Amino acid sequence: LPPHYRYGMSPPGSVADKRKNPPWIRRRPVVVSDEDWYLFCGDTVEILEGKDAGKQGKVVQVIRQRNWVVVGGLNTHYRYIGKTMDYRGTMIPSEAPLLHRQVKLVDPMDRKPTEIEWRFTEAGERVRVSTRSGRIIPKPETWIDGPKDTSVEDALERTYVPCLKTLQEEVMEAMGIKETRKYKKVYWY
Amino acid sequence: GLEEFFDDPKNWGQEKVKSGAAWTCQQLRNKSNEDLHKLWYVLLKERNMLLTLEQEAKRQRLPMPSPERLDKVVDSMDALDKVVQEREDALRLLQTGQERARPGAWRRDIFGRIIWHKFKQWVIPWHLNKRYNRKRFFALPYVDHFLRLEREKRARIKARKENLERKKAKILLKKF
Amino acid sequence: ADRMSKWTSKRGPRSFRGRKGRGAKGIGFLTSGWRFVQIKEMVPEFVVPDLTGFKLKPYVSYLAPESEETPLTAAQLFSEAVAPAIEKDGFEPTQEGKLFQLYPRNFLR
Amino acid sequence: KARGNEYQPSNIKRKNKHGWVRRLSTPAGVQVILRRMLKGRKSLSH
Amino acid sequence: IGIRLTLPPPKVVDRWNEKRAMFGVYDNIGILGNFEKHPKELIRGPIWLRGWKGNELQRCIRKRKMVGSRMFADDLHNLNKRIRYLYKHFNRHGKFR
Amino acid sequence: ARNVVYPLYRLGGPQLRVFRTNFFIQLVRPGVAQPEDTVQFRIPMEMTRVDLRNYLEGIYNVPVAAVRTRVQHGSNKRRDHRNVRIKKPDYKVAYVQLAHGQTFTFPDLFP
RNA sequence: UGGCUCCACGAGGGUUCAGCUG
RNA sequence: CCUCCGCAUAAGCCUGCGUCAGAUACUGACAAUUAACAGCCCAAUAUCUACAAUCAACCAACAAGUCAUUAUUACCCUCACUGUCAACCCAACACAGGCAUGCUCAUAAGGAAAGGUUAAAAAAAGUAAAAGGAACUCGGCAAAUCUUACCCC
RNA sequence: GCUACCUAAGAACAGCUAAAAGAGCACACCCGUCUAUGUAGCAAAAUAGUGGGAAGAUUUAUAGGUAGAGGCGACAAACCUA
RNA sequence: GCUAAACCUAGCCCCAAACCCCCACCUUACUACCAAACCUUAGCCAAACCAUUUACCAAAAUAAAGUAUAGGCGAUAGAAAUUGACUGGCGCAAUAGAUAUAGUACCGCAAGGGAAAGAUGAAAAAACCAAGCAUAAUAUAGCAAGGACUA
Ligand SMILES: [Mg+2]
Ligand SMILES: [Mg+2]
Ligand SMILES: [Mg+2]
Ligand SMILES: [Mg+2]
Ligand SMILES: [Mg+2]
Ligand SMILES: [Mg+2]
Ligand SMILES: [Mg+2]
Ligand SMILES: [Mg+2]
Ligand SMILES: [Mg+2]
Ligand SMILES: [Mg+2]
Ligand SMILES: [Mg+2]
Ligand SMILES: [Mg+2]
Ligand SMILES: [Mg+2]
Ligand SMILES: [Mg+2]
Ligand SMILES: [Mg+2]
Ligand SMILES: [Mg+2]
Ligand SMILES: [Mg+2]
């Protein structure tokens, strides 16, 4: 990505981004970086105002570099998508982003919009807890290998006995290469 | 070995090949030295395979199957290089106490900049190398004035930058 | 008359084109016929181990555990290498007679 | 006669006349390089 | 066409700002703080014009002799060129010779 | 290896060994109908015929009978939106003629 | 300060004859 | 139907009519020039070299000339690196100009003067012209056919 | 890198006549006498015919040297990047 | 109704504070490896020419003081002793503010010269008017109008 480039929800390596910001434009920014940021990709939040004012949803992706979150299935508009020719074709929804400090988190037992502060419990170390009550908020979130992946024990053999040898010297003695001759001294200036 | 410049013939054109989890510096630290030699050559053969596949993908204009695993293999190579150079650095510090593995000096070229001059391993000593003695490691009193001007050019760029950051913050606080 | 393009071996008179060359290292020396003598010791030898019967292979599993970063500091290598000093209660004084000298490096990579 | 073409190129003349080695030989040429460096020039010599 | 076609965003002014609301305080610090300060010492500014007025030549002369040895080199060169020009101008031009 | 200071050889010193080669080559489809037992390679600029022959002999156990090389110029003719020139790089191409009539032929990947 | 002859040469400067031709 | 053209090296450029795809020799992608030709040389200490070339043979000069190693010491390890494309370079231009050397003496190579009409004037170039033959003109300038003599410098 | 002069190591000069001459006619090349075209041109000096030299005080490639009241000049206030 | 026109932040300016900065590369730079720096500025310019002279530049508040002093005693020049010394903006807003989107592209053999320009928005994973024309060529007579007129 370049500087003076606007973050769309499309990833930077895409045709939509390549045609939204081609490398020969110049544009003004939008003002939005206070790293202490509490929404994460995979949480359940509660939209307050706008379209569907007062509803609950799931956070799919976070535009954390532009103070945006987009919630799953909510805050949506519509677009003729695909359709490849001069007829009506297909209609698909798209989801517009939503603003922080306007959407709040949901406690799994209170089911109300809450504000959450990063206090430091004794469990370890800094986990989301509410300020009006407790009931600590968790963190949001099968492969078997092929022919070119090692087992875990093969990756964790721990065959390094430390010694004062260079890799060069150790591999010399390991493969049995003998070098009788001696390196003549050069001037390094 | 041209059959190992190419990957497995069953995998040719399957749009996705399941291979993941590049190596990590911690695992490579746990491995030995002869083991790291062998793993370097394993990764080298597989990396030549991946570069061959990428070039042929460009030639036929079809999408490359697994760019993520070529990224993983270059990561694995760079991690193994880092690990072996850490062992070399640590042993050099113990036996010689030298921070850099190649000698140098802090010289001052014709333009009066202070450079790190890395040494260069000749055969005759320095005082009779004709070419070396043509090179100059000192400046002169006209380089003086030019040094002042370059210093102030940098001072101006830095003053511009700090002023602009403060102005950005002020208009941001107007907005919020 | 491009100043801005790089200067290469494709870009001059016949003598310039013969003298410049890319960054390939020398392999011998030129004498007295314009005849070239290749020195076998100047030619680098690839030291390649035997990889048959081997288990380390170019990826790991995703089932491998996560472990935190610990760069190999000289103090750590020291303690791991001379716990036998504690047992009692190797070091090179100079490096002239050594093949793989540490500081003014003798070796490649 | 027709007087357009005073530039008869040769890279030996170009490098010998305006090169980095020649600039750095003279103390006035060292100042030429220093001036291009201060101006910010992407190419300081031939 | 030169005229702006859509009228601008509204400039909204905080007249009861902190700087606005306390403008002018500790002027009269001398006359009603028994004279141990001076409002010229209340002035925040450059060193060479702070409690002084002068005209453009005198401002350049005073800037050269008060802060001139810390100036950047071509800023001095422009200042010396400007004193030289303004000398020629104020001493040799205009009416009223 | 590339971008590494080579140790000088004076008269009777050790041979230059390399452990952990820095050279990554790739096997390319020929563009102009090279014979049987000619493999084509794209190679870093610092790698000689002797380096490529010993690379293929040791790492891959290919018997190499002849190596030829050339330097391909890449085009500096493309321009940006700034009218500043885009340089496609310069690379090195080698033509490896196999031994004992081993007769490589480039496979049809991407079927 | 020469002077009188003086041969060859000239996309130099004039003149004559002959032819030839818009 | 045309051409002091064409091919090659040198110097200079630096991928600049190869394939494919796209838009209106342009754009992008993919390819490509492979050393045997050419370049990048020479371990020295002392020392040796009066004799031209020109078919070099008589013979002819004056302006008096380029090609050259030996005694000894040390030296067997052998063939790397780089150039290699094109309709090209210098003239702001796809410029009737500039551009070294070898070879072909009209080409075996390379090219196309006419977008399509019409057939006015003026203009450019060409060819032909009765009778006359410089009467033109500053002057036989240009054309046409070839020539003589005298002066001035 | 044009141009003036010089230095170093190179090259070119058909044919006929003549028989080593700054020789004759005349190509290649070098120059630029006359005319005509051209003039924002093909060209910030060209084109077309006509012409002068063409074994030499010749032309010419490559590299180098002389630098501004200076260089260089077979003096034209000539040339020294239109 | 075409061509357009409109926009606001990219940055910049002046102050304050505080002293700042793996490889290859002097050979033909960006190329693995072989037998010496140190010397008064001049002149334009004022003197209405110019010839002695002619401000400052070569760290020095306010006043003494434009005084003593110098000087074709003229243009002008000119002391000293002594004397009290926390960031902001009635700055620019894209021909402006920096040359700067860049010392780039382009020009020059070289030193060197040296540009231009962008504006949909919360999300694009969504309207009118410069000149010039056009809609719509012209009808005796003339600085193109004015007095007028039913016109
Ligand atoms: Mg004559
Ligand atoms: Mg021209
Ligand atoms: Mg033909
Ligand atoms: Mg026509
Ligand atoms: Mg007639
Ligand atoms: Mg008459
Ligand atoms: Mg008459
Ligand atoms: Mg005539
Ligand atoms: Mg003659
Ligand atoms: Mg005449
Ligand atoms: Mg002359
Ligand atoms: Mg005269
Ligand atoms: Mg005269
Ligand atoms: Mg005067
Ligand atoms: Mg501007
Ligand atoms: Mg500008
Ligand atoms: Mg209008």
PDB file of N, CA, C and O (backbone and C1' of nucleotides) and ligand atoms in Angstrom, chain D residues 4, chain H residues 91-93 95, chain I residues 43-45 82, ligand 2:
ATOM      1  N   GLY D   4      23.548  21.055 -37.089  1.00  0.00           N
ATOM      2  CA  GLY D   4      22.751  20.637 -35.960  1.00  0.00           C
ATOM      3  C   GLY D   4      23.487  19.748 -34.985  1.00  0.00           C
ATOM      4  O   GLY D   4      23.168  19.730 -33.796  1.00  0.00           O
TER       5      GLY D   4
ATOM      6  P     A H  91      21.880  14.709 -31.277  1.00  0.00           P
ATOM      7  O5'   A H  91      21.274  15.057 -32.699  1.00  0.00           O
ATOM      8  C5'   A H  91      20.256  16.022 -32.888  1.00  0.00           C
ATOM      9  C4'   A H  91      20.418  16.668 -34.232  1.00  0.00           C
ATOM     10  C3'   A H  91      19.178  17.231 -34.898  1.00  0.00           C
ATOM     11  O3'   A H  91      18.822  18.499 -34.413  1.00  0.00           O
ATOM     12  C1'   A H  91      20.372  15.953 -36.450  1.00  0.00           C
ATOM     13  P     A H  92      17.327  18.819 -33.965  1.00  0.00           P
ATOM     14  O5'   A H  92      16.822  17.518 -33.218  1.00  0.00           O
ATOM     15  C5'   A H  92      16.908  17.392 -31.806  1.00  0.00           C
ATOM     16  C4'   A H  92      15.559  17.202 -31.163  1.00  0.00           C
ATOM     17  C3'   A H  92      14.574  16.324 -31.903  1.00  0.00           C
ATOM     18  O3'   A H  92      14.787  14.943 -31.677  1.00  0.00           O
ATOM     19  C1'   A H  92      13.508  18.318 -31.235  1.00  0.00           C
ATOM     20  P     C H  93      14.737  13.905 -32.895  1.00  0.00           P
ATOM     21  O5'   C H  93      13.302  14.126 -33.501  1.00  0.00           O
ATOM     22  C5'   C H  93      12.171  13.694 -32.775  1.00  0.00           C
ATOM     23  C4'   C H  93      10.971  13.524 -33.657  1.00  0.00           C
ATOM     24  C3'   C H  93      11.119  12.449 -34.718  1.00  0.00           C
ATOM     25  O3'   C H  93       9.947  11.648 -34.773  1.00  0.00           O
ATOM     26  C1'   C H  93      10.570  14.530 -35.730  1.00  0.00           C
ATOM     27  P     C H  95      12.877   9.779 -40.439  1.00  0.00           P
ATOM     28  O5'   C H  95      12.658  11.332 -40.206  1.00  0.00           O
ATOM     29  C5'   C H  95      11.737  12.057 -41.013  1.00  0.00           C
ATOM     30  C4'   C H  95      12.393  13.178 -41.764  1.00  0.00           C
ATOM     31  C3'   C H  95      13.686  12.808 -42.480  1.00  0.00           C
ATOM     32  O3'   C H  95      13.790  13.525 -43.713  1.00  0.00           O
ATOM     33  C1'   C H  95      14.105  14.484 -40.831  1.00  0.00           C
TER      34        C H  95
ATOM     35  P     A I  43      12.533  20.008 -42.234  1.00  0.00           P
ATOM     36  O5'   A I  43      14.065  20.368 -42.389  1.00  0.00           O
ATOM     37  C5'   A I  43      15.069  19.569 -41.791  1.00  0.00           C
ATOM     38  C4'   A I  43      16.433  20.105 -42.118  1.00  0.00           C
ATOM     39  C3'   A I  43      16.681  21.545 -41.734  1.00  0.00           C
ATOM     40  O3'   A I  43      17.074  21.683 -40.388  1.00  0.00           O
ATOM     41  C1'   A I  43      17.462  21.155 -43.926  1.00  0.00           C
ATOM     42  P     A I  44      16.175  22.458 -39.320  1.00  0.00           P
ATOM     43  O5'   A I  44      16.909  23.841 -39.100  1.00  0.00           O
ATOM     44  C5'   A I  44      17.123  24.750 -40.158  1.00  0.00           C
ATOM     45  C4'   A I  44      17.874  25.963 -39.689  1.00  0.00           C
ATOM     46  C3'   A I  44      19.292  25.714 -39.229  1.00  0.00           C
ATOM     47  O3'   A I  44      20.201  25.770 -40.306  1.00  0.00           O
ATOM     48  C1'   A I  44      18.141  26.956 -37.594  1.00  0.00           C
ATOM     49  P     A I  45      21.207  24.571 -40.606  1.00  0.00           P
ATOM     50  O5'   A I  45      21.553  24.755 -42.128  1.00  0.00           O
ATOM     51  C5'   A I  45      20.857  24.041 -43.129  1.00  0.00           C
ATOM     52  C4'   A I  45      21.355  24.386 -44.504  1.00  0.00           C
ATOM     53  C3'   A I  45      22.829  24.150 -44.766  1.00  0.00           C
ATOM     54  O3'   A I  45      22.986  23.698 -46.098  1.00  0.00           O
ATOM     55  C1'   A I  45      22.310  26.443 -45.097  1.00  0.00           C
ATOM     56  P     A I  82      25.923  26.219 -29.579  1.00  0.00           P
ATOM     57  O5'   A I  82      26.041  26.813 -31.038  1.00  0.00           O
ATOM     58  C5'   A I  82      26.207  25.974 -32.165  1.00  0.00           C
ATOM     59  C4'   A I  82      25.706  26.625 -33.423  1.00  0.00           C
ATOM     60  C3'   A I  82      24.989  27.940 -33.221  1.00  0.00           C
ATOM     61  O3'   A I  82      25.145  28.755 -34.386  1.00  0.00           O
ATOM     62  C1'   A I  82      23.462  26.312 -34.027  1.00  0.00           C
TER      63        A I  82
HETATM   64 MG    MG K   2      16.757  20.120 -36.979  1.00  0.00          MG
END
